[PDB]
Amino acid sequence: GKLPPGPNTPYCFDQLRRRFGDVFSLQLAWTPVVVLNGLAAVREALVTHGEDTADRPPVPITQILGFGPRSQGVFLARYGPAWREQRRFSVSTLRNLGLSLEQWVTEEAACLCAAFANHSGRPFRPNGLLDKAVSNVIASLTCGRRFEYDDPRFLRLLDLAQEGLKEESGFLREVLNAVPVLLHIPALAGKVLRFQKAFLTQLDELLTEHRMTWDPAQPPRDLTEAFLAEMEKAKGNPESSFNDENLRIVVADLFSAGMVTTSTTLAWGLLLMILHPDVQRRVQQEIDDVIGQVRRPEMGDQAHMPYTTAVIHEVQRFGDIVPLGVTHMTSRDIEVQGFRIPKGTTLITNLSSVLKDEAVWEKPFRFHPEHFLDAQGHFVKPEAFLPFSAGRRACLGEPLARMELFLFFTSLLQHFSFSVPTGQPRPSHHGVFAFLVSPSPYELCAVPR
Numbered sequence: 001g002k003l004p005p006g007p008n009t010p011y012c013f014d015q016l017r018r019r020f021g022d023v024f025s026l027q028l029a030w031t032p033v034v035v036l037n038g039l040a041a042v043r044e045a046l047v048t049h050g051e052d053t054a055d056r057p058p059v060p061i062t063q064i065l066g067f068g069p070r071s072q073g074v075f076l077a078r079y080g081p082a083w084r085e086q087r088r089f090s091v092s093t094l095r096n097l098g099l100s101l102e103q104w105v106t107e108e109a110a111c112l113c114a115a116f117a118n119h120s121g122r123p124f125r126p127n128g129l130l131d132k133a134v135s136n137v138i139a140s141l142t143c144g145r146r147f148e149y150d151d152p153r154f155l156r157l158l159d160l161a162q163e164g165l166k167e168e169s170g171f172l173r174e175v176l177n178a179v180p181v182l183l184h185i186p187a188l189a190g191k192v193l194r195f196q197k198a199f200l201t202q203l204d205e206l207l208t209e210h211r212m213t214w215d216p217a218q219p220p221r222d223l224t225e226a227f228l229a230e231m232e233k234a235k236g237n238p239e240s241s242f243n244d245e246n247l248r249i250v251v252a253d254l255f256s257a258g259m260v261t262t263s264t265t266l267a268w269g270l271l272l273m274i275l276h277p278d279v280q281r282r283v284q285q286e287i288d289d290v291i292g293q294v295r296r297p298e299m300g301d302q303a304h305m306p307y308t309t310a311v312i313h314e315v316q317r318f319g320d321i322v323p324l325g326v327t328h329m330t331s332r333d334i335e336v337q338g339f340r341i342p343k344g345t346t347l348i349t350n351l352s353s354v355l356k357d358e359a360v361w362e363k364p365f366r367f368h369p370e371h372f373l374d375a376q377g378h379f380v381k382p383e384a385f386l387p388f389s390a391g392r393r394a395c396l397g398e399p400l401a402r403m404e405l406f407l408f409f410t411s412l413l414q415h416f417s418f419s420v421p422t423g424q425p426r427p428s429h430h431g432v433f434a435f436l437v438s439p440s441p442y443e444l445c446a447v448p449r
């Protein structure tokens with residue numbers, strides 16, 4: 001079996017793809033890595049061989065966060081029953097709460113609009129408030145409450161989360177994962193994940209309060225209550241993943257996976273609306289013709305707003321916030337584009353190469369909403385639209401994220417006209433790579449309509 005050819009990062013991989021093709025390999029430290037580029041490669045790996053590519057590479061430092069065999073959360077959980085039980089529970093719970101989450105999102109959108117209006121037309125960076133609105137949607141899903149935009153514990157929670165994102169990058173974490181033995185030195189153990197650990201600690205305090213107000217004689221109001229109820233039925237069952245050590249991990253996974261993604265996406269959205277005011281006006285025209293100017297947007301509006309739906313999809317395509325997705329690990333030998341992938345290889349899915357594929361999209365490096373329209377103005381979704389990846393491990397947040405993007409974006413453009421402040425440089429459309437790819441900082445003016 002022949003192996004893939006091969007010898008900041010997103011540009012580098014797209015460079016190597018040019019040189020060695022769509023499936024190439026690397027040795028990143030002591031990890032054999034295979035990178036997949038383009039729709040064909042990614043689907044072959046994640047769908048056709050989806051059974052064998054749905055594992056995660058082990059992360060030894062998660063011991064520090066209370067992880068264990070039946071306590072792996074969902075995002076990093078190894079392929080196996082502790083992942084599948086929590087995967088199915090979150091997917092189902094999200095779905096059940098639809099029957100609601102939309103009500104929580106819609107209320108949050110009105111809170112956000114009111115917070116935007118308080119800037120009375122003066123320039124401001126939108127990011128802070130977008131984070132808060134998006135964080136309160138997760139708060140609503142997980143604990144059945146929101147927090148005020150100036151609640152002290154709410155702000156510390158978001159602060160801890162931002163600092164915890166940074167801890168995903170570093171020399172220290174790379175060494176400790178390589179040799180988990182170094183974790184016996186307390187000086188090192190206490191430093192690796194101090195912000196993520198502090199987040200969980202702050203979270204415990206919220207979960208303890210929620211556990212006091214839970215009414216178990218009523219149907220669960222939110223996901224923590226659904227979990228607690230499952231935890232009751234599972235007392236006496238050492239096989240269950242429904243336990244107090246997993247609860248805090250699963251809820252931390254939903255916050256930390258769901259905040260920065262949806263928020264960054266919305267930040268790209270507003271930036272592209274001030275760089276392309278003509279798209280903005282067309283969206284505001286479609287809003288006026290379908291929704292009007294008083295009534296709050298509802299999810300039922302989306303099927304009648306093909307242009308707004310195109311724009312929101314193009315924001316995700318152009319924004320391309322998670323260029324390299326989330327790593328997978330193979331649990332069996334597989335074949336991709338002919339090449340042999342050994343068991344235990346880390347797979348990197350180059351989602352950027354799918355979203356920006358020049359063979360598929362008309363002008364992939366332009367902001368071009370017609371990427372999702374046909375000449376008639378019908379919304380069409382190409383198969384290369386994979387901002388959430390594919391297969392068994394594809395973003396379980398996707399239905400909620402879709403709801404948030406549509407209800408936050410259209411609520412905002414319903415009530416405000418957005419522009420570049422009249423004395424500043426046209427902000428760049430080029431992102432800042434980090435954990436996520438986010439817009440380079442900008443301010444905007446939001447004036448009522």
Ligand code: HEM
Pocket residue numbers: 074075076087253254255257258259261262265321322325326327349387388389390392393394395396397398400401
């Ligand atoms: C625009 C917003 C979002 C984007 C672009 C996004 C993107 C992604 C991607 C690329 C993955 C990796 C799939 C893979 O492993 O191949 C992922 C996984 C995941 N996402 Fe999202 N995400 C978004 C919002 C959310 C939200 C709102 C939540 C929670 C409600 C969420 C929760 C998760 C979880 C738990 C996983 C792990 C799934 C698993 O391992 O089974 N995400 N997301």
Ligand SMILES: C=C[C@H]1CN2CC[C@H]1C[C@@H]2[C@@H](O)c1ccnc2ccc(OC)cc12
Pocket residue numbers: 065075160161162163164165168195196197199200249252253256257326
């Ligand atoms: C590729 C990164 C993924 C790994 N975790 C699950 C989803 C994302 C982010 C998150 C973690 O980095 C993280 C970031 C920020 N604050 C956190 C707070 C607690 C936490 O508990 C597991 C994990 C956190």
Ligand SMILES: [Zn+2]
Pocket residue numbers: 143144210214221222224225
């Ligand atoms: Zn509750």
Ligand SMILES: [Zn+2]
Pocket residue numbers: 374376377378
């Ligand atoms: Zn058509």
